[PDB]
Design an enzyme around this catalytic site. Structure first.
Site, PDB file in Angstrom:
ATOM      1  N   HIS A 222       1.067   5.677  -9.959  1.00  0.00           N
ATOM      2  CA  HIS A 222      -0.212   5.507  -9.115  1.00  0.00           C
ATOM      3  C   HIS A 222      -1.052   4.478  -8.063  1.00  0.00           C
ATOM      4  CE1 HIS A 222      -4.032   3.422 -11.693  1.00  0.00           C
ATOM      5  NE2 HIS A 222      -3.870   2.473 -10.787  1.00  0.00           N
ATOM      6  N   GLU A 223       0.554   3.788  -7.487  1.00  0.00           N
ATOM      7  CA  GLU A 223      -0.209   2.714  -6.335  1.00  0.00           C
ATOM      8  C   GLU A 223       0.271   3.427  -5.369  1.00  0.00           C
ATOM      9  OE1 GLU A 223      -1.838   0.372  -7.085  1.00  0.00           O
ATOM     10  OE2 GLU A 223      -0.312   0.177  -8.723  1.00  0.00           O
TER      11      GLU A 223
ATOM     12  N   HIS B 130      -3.555   5.427  -4.570  1.00  0.00           N
ATOM     13  CA  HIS B 130      -4.156   4.359  -3.785  1.00  0.00           C
ATOM     14  C   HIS B 130      -3.657   4.733  -2.171  1.00  0.00           C
ATOM     15  CE1 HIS B 130      -5.898   2.440  -6.870  1.00  0.00           C
ATOM     16  NE2 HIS B 130      -5.227   1.890  -7.520  1.00  0.00           N
TER      17      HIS B 130
ATOM     18  N   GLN C 102      -6.968  -1.435  -2.235  1.00  0.00           N
ATOM     19  CA  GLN C 102      -7.308  -2.286  -2.870  1.00  0.00           C
ATOM     20  C   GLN C 102      -8.150  -3.450  -2.594  1.00  0.00           C
ATOM     21  OE1 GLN C 102      -4.483  -1.192  -6.646  1.00  0.00           O
ATOM     22  NE2 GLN C 102      -6.469  -1.049  -7.607  1.00  0.00           N
TER      23      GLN C 102
ATOM     24  N   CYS D 266      -7.338   0.388 -13.797  1.00  0.00           N
ATOM     25  CA  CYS D 266      -6.835   0.312 -12.744  1.00  0.00           C
ATOM     26  C   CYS D 266      -7.585  -0.608 -12.898  1.00  0.00           C
ATOM     27  CB  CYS D 266      -7.208   1.243 -11.428  1.00  0.00           C
ATOM     28  SG  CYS D 266      -7.172   1.086 -10.120  1.00  0.00           S
ATOM     29  N   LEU D 267      -7.753  -1.810 -11.750  1.00  0.00           N
ATOM     30  CA  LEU D 267      -8.006  -2.668 -11.278  1.00  0.00           C
ATOM     31  C   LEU D 267      -9.741  -2.408 -10.599  1.00  0.00           C
ATOM     32  CD1 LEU D 267      -4.991  -5.873 -10.247  1.00  0.00           C
ATOM     33  CD2 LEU D 267      -7.292  -5.635 -12.299  1.00  0.00           C
TER      34      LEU D 267
END
Ligand SMILES: CCCCC[C@H](CN(O)C=O)C(=O)N[C@H](C(=O)N1CCC[C@H]1CS)C(C)C
Ligand SMILES: [Zn+2]
Length: 164
Positions: free
Chosen positions: A132-133, A136, A50, A90-91
């Protein structure tokens, strides 16, 4: 200190991170900068992809007081069980939320900030955040679990927001 967080539709968010080869002072600086970015953006997790770093590094803190730092370097999913889901944000997908199916429990191995291997059994929110991470790091976003039309609606709203 505060790295730039990428937002969709940036193709860098689809890049697949390489494993960290050695946990050294450079990797520890990245970890520390990722925490400073995560907290500045009010997040509970952040993946290296990210912030445009193509290494398998995740930082997490699900605590209210922002004092429970979890570092996952080269994480491996050993086992998962059950099913759950919450409204995830999510950022990289600003201001959008959706319910995503997730495992309820996960067992992972990773390296910590010192390079030491460890194993973690997590459930609930922490298990959801770990999945979730980890997604990514292989170029996967929570919106990918949604229908194609909901994905396009998300993409256009984020783009509207970013065009300001
Ligand atoms: C709930 C699953 C893990 C969430 C991680 C995400 C940060 N992120 O995108 C990392 O990949 C996060 O902290 N979301 C916040 C949220 O959902 N409440 C808000 C900042 C939107
Ligand atoms: Zn995210």
């Amino acid at each position: 200190s505060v790295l730039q967080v990428l937002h969709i539709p940036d193709e860098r968010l689809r890049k697949v991170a390489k494993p960290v080869e050695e946990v050294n002072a450079e990797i520890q600086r990245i970890v520390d900068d990722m925490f400073e970015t995560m907290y500045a953006e009010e997040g509970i997790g952040l993946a290296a992809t990210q912030v445009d770093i193509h290494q398998r590094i995740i930082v997490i803190d699900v605590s209210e007081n922002r004092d429970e730092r979890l570092v996952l370097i080269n994480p491996e999913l050993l086992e998962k069980s059950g099913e759950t889901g919450i409204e995830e944000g999510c950022l990289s997908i600003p201001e959008q939320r959706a319910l995503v199916p997730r495992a309820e429990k996960v067992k992972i191995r990773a390296l910590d900030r010192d390079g030491k291997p460890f194993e973690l059994e997590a459930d609930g929110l922490l298990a959801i955040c770990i999945q979730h991470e980890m997604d990514h790091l292989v170029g996967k976003l929570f919106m990918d679990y949604l229908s194609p039309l909901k994905q396009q609606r998300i993409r256009q709203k984020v783009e509207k927001l970013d065009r300001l």
